[PDB]
Amino acid sequence: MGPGFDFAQAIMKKNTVIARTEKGEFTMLGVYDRVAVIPTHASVGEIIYINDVETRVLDACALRDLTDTNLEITIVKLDRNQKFRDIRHFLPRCEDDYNDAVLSVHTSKFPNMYIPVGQVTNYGFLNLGGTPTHRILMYNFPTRAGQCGGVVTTTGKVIGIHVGGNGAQGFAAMLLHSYFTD
Incomplete structure (x- = not known):
């Protein structure tokens, strides 16, 4: 749109x-x-x-x-x-907050799905399914089962992958350029 x-x-x-x-x-x-x-x-x-x-x-x-x-x-x-296609140049170098993000999913259950999630907080620590987890991004969208692995983007950046939710908020793991140096 x-x-x-x-x-x-x-x-x-x-x-x-x-x-x-x-x-x-x-x-x-x-x-x-x-x-x-x-x-x-x-x-x-x-x-x-x-x-x-x-x-x-x-x-x-x-x-x-x-x-x-x-x-x-x-x-x-x-x-x-x-x-x-090499997309490493769209990865952020540092931990950050973002405006106006989109969560995009493509599975048998949810083909061609795009969700405008709005503002993304550098949340940091999350107890995710009982497991202490770091570098978590948070957005205020009621994301559901089937969205895990979903890609979080802004214009020109690929910033995370969806890993969970609590019914009201959704959580993504940061992607950083440093993970993919070779």
Whole structure:
């Protein structure tokens, strides 16, 4: 409908796949080469389904900060025959608050879904499903089951992936440029 949705759509159309684990279907953001991200509660194993195709996982790393606190981001390298468009230059370098964000989801349950979530707070610490978690972004939208892995964008930045909600607020794990240096 406007330039926020334009940027979100451009990311969804080229840089997302549907990932299926034994824990469900997730929006999965491809970042560069064969490297993607998914919430850690997806419990990625040795094999994953990517757009309903059996795919070997070459590497999977559940990120933690240097206090050894959960970040809820898993970085996955996929044995796929095709690279992602490199979007690392759209990743923020530092922790920040944002205005006018969009949460975008693409699954069998929720195809081509876009939600204007408005203002995003650097919330920081969250007890997420009983697990102490850091670098959490918060938005005041009543997000539901099926939105995990959803991409949070502003115009020109890819800032997080949706990891939970409490019925009134939604929570995303930050994406930082430093996670994807090679």
